[PDB]
């Protein structure tokens, strides 16, 4: 049977999720929408040819007994309150990052879900679902390169919009690595430090530092070096290299595009959009959520604990952003509920 979905938030993010559920993935249907902007909600129904009703707010939608699961895909600041409400219900929950924009709010959600019969929340960290990244982790876990000593990564983006702030280097960009690394290494973070090299001439947003360097440390002593470069011009790219005791593993170059021999050069195109780069990951992620719901079983993707870990780490990062000093992280052991 079909999973009956309600979507909370109908901006571009919400719309993309709607499109995915309606036209790409199997086994689901969007039967309700709401947004603070009621007209954007109506617009979603119209544009996507849904048999859905428009609720005026999350509370009312969430009372609809025929909805199996909700997608919390509003703007980030709105997630906390909405997740909280949905936790009053028996509905399954898929929220986009972040779990909450603050670390107490995330702790709140975790504390509340810990009161329940079963896990219901999945957090939308798609990286874990990327075929390349996943294959790398799997290879690492074989033990073929021994213990991971150092991780070097890059999060490269061509340019940013006028509204992109310094904090967003963490919250919108680095957040992906933040969730990824502890999962990759099966280890916990003990510190983060953000440093700033010389400022790029490409920046034209007030207060935005670019590029940024983020160093993280783990319990077992693995050191993580991440390059964040969001005005790089050339393209969108995600690089990942694990340095092990007896060898190394890195992601291959991404691209299906042909190699062109022409004009004293050999070249291949480079992806310009993060949307395109991670189409597969997003599809796989959401299909898994649906699959689990269809079985009335808890999600097996990133949990609220994962969201909370990320929230903590990002808070620390934003603190490091002020003065470039190291900030210690101490994440309490994973509750059994989240194990």
């Amino acid at each position: 049977m079909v999973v009956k979905v309600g979507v909370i938030g109908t901006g571009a993010m919400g719309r993309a999720h709607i499109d995915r559920l309606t036209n790409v993935l199997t086994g689901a249907e969007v039967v309700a929408v709401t947004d603070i902007d009621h007209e954007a909600a109506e617009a979603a129904v119209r544009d996507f040819h849904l048999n859905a009703k428009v609720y005026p707010d999350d509370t009312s939608l969430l009372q609809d007994p025929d909805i199996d699961a909700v997608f919390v895909v509003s703007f980030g600041g709105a997630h906390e309150a909405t997740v909280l409400k949905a936790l009053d219900t028996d509905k399954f929950i898929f929220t986009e990052k972040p779990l909450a924009t603050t670390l107490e709010g995330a702790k709140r959600i975790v504390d509340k879900e810990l009161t329940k019969s079963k896990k219901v929340i999945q957090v939308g960290f798609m990286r874990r679902y990327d075929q390349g990244i996943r294959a790398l982790k799997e290879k690492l876990d074989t033990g073929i390169i021994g213990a991971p000593l150092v991780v070097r990564a890059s999060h490269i983006n061509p340019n940013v919009a006028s509204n992109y702030s310094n904090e967003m280097a963490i919250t919108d960009t680095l957040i992906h690595e933040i969730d990824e690394m502890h999962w990759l290494l099966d280890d916990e973070y003990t510190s983060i430090q953000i440093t700033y090299p010389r400022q790029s001439a490409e920046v034209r947003n007030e207060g935005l530092h670019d590029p940024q360097l983020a160093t993280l440390t783990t319990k077992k002593g693995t050191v993580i070096q991440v390059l964040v470069h969001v005005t790089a011009q050339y393209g969108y790219e995600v690089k990942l290299e694990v340095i092990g005791e007896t060898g190394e593993l890195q992601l291959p170059n991404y691209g299906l595009g042909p190699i062109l021999r022409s004009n004293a050069n050999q070249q291949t195109a480079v992806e310009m959009s993060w949307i395109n780069r991670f189409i597969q990951a997003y599809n796989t992620e959401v299909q898994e959520f649906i699959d689990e719901v269809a079985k009335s079983e808890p999600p097996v993707g990133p949990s609220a604990w994962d969201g909370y870990i990320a929230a903590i780490t990002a808070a620390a990062a934003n603190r490091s952003q002020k003065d470039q000093e190291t900030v210690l992280i101490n994440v309490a052991g994973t509750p059994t509920f989240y194990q």
Copy 2:
């Protein structure tokens, strides 16, 4: 049970590796379809497919019985290649839509038979599974070629590499099972027609375990505009499954990049990456895209828009010529008829 817009009920004829793969995708990945019936010459294989993919589906003892189930909207012919002909023919006696894996038939006579029969119908119902046309990388290459950036295509060099074959793999299947892909592909890629084909036999591999199988095989094809195509067919290559495509142009070259998701490993005095061992895995996107298109047409009760029985026939003409060439390694001329209105 007829969701977002009408759930296509599917019957699957042949539940080997490929058939299993189609079932998986139709059940678990693609939208708007359900497999409600299967069959295979090995009844235990059919049963295993129903079990393994958690289907609520009938197991029929043969193709004819399955084809007489009124509730099925479309059939997939995924049996042994030499079985395709009879099954397609039988199916054309129904109103069901038909997706057949390559080849359309193993003989020219067979292919013509199917075209002749389908031409007697009010509407086109057959799609042939030439999935290369749907491969993102192959399409990207074609797109780029068609911008004119390398000028005219002068020579194409390609490889169809396969690690090992089953005991039923015949010399003739080097053409009908394997080279068939390149045969369809190149004329689509170049928007051109063939004028000849020649098969030559280099030094026989010690890895061959099938009586009468020559491997590797070289296929040289010529086109109307004069483009020369050099295909390497190597099916006991051991190392992996691999498709290579290189187009030599007047002012440049275009090449298909290496296929892989897997990581680069630095270890033991080598830098290395995994090579795919299975054609099923390698073309998973192509298969998904292709089959979804088919399903999407069936849903609307419209004719398929992908490769047709005529494309099957064109390929079969060339394949036949190759099978003939296989006998003396001499060049065999080719002249394909114009496309009937039905297939335009």
Copy 3:
């Protein structure tokens, strides 16, 4: 002790050999030169600051007893007479390809050399000294891919000069692969066939077919497929792929230059000159020759017999060029002298 050299022909390749012998390699000195253009000869002496004498012709240069070795680096058609003359002396002989422009001319030379006490001729097939190519052959010889079943190669050239003829597709270009393959494979040719694909619009030389496809066959049954493309525009490139029973080998991309990430592309430069590409091969070839002359030992590199094999194959190819028909090749057994 130092190898004293006479150079015959001081064109571009000649000056190159002189410059190499003078300023790059060790253990030789050029003490005599000649060229059809006596002023070209004079120039070479002048420009490279040699203590050398200038002779009117080859014969006269050859009567200088101070000379240990001669380099025959004149127009290929003059090579034959010059080599035969040099053989009337005691001197070691390095000749740029070809050994002779007719196989009857090649046979003449071999027959003459066969009347000597020791071997003195090295033919300049530099491909054999290229590190990449050598490394491929070495790997092949490990048996790691089983027996070689098919070879696929490309000889790519961006453009040709106005003196470039259809026959030069064989004699100046394909000649390198002609020598290379039998050595690569420890084999002998049984046939050759030249076919013409559609003619390139880039061709500006009268009578020239481009590209050309050459197919050779060997006694062990290996099939060789060479693409000759001399108006390819994009660059100079040599490609080599060996298809084995249990694996494949191929040359990597040539280049020390950086990978550039820019403007929605990833790219590397492509070499435009065969001269630049084969610097190392040439240096290695010649240094070895000198090293052997310094020891009064016969050269170990390609021989007059290799020259002959090439002449026969090339003749057969020029014949095939008439009608695109397969031409048979029957290489006679190797005399012990050349073993």
Copy 4:
């Protein structure tokens, strides 16, 4: 005419330099040697068929009036005194790194050299002569990627000898990056910080930390992240990547070896020794020195001032190895003598 050379130190590096001078490069002859192990020096003469005098020590060798230049190649601690002694003569001086093991010693040499009527010292920083590295720098200097914001590098080695100490991670290994970066960027350092990730289980030397992370800052604000990893097992590798405002540049993979398709992978070999990696670089470096000496012009390669910079940076780094704290660097203006 021929540059007459003395070699001080006939160990591995010394013998390699001897081989180079004798059998590979042009226009030099080794006519005198010494080693603290007299038998090693004698062996060198035998093994390389030198017409050379064996001296009992450096001082005595330096008394030889026939010698045009000396190579200081003994163990690093010795270097300092030997170079100073050489400065008492008029001979040209090529010293392998370091210039001296104490920054005080380095300055002593610079000071002494400044008293002379021409620059005589070349320091053996071979990386500057590497074709790949040079080519990257050249492309960088075109401005095609804009300003260099970050540099990421790796110095990878498979295993070390039992005599390899913690401080040698700086002095024997990172020292190459220490000279290189400031040349590449045409910028000076402001700080250095050494950081220890978890300890590899492959380390078998008392006190050695591996891997080590080096962060350097420059005056224009470029940040340099070097990974030093000397027990990596898999091979020897040098990596370099420059992150720019509008693009990136990186060294391609090193290797002329073939691509092998076998056993469900595609692979290429990796060098196991630094020796083959930089043969070209060493050859180019020394041939340049010999060429200058032959003209009696000062060397144009890295100088004692470059040695001083390296020493200061190295010292600051050995200091950082104690507490993993950042150490400031403030190098004085370059004396006109050394521009």
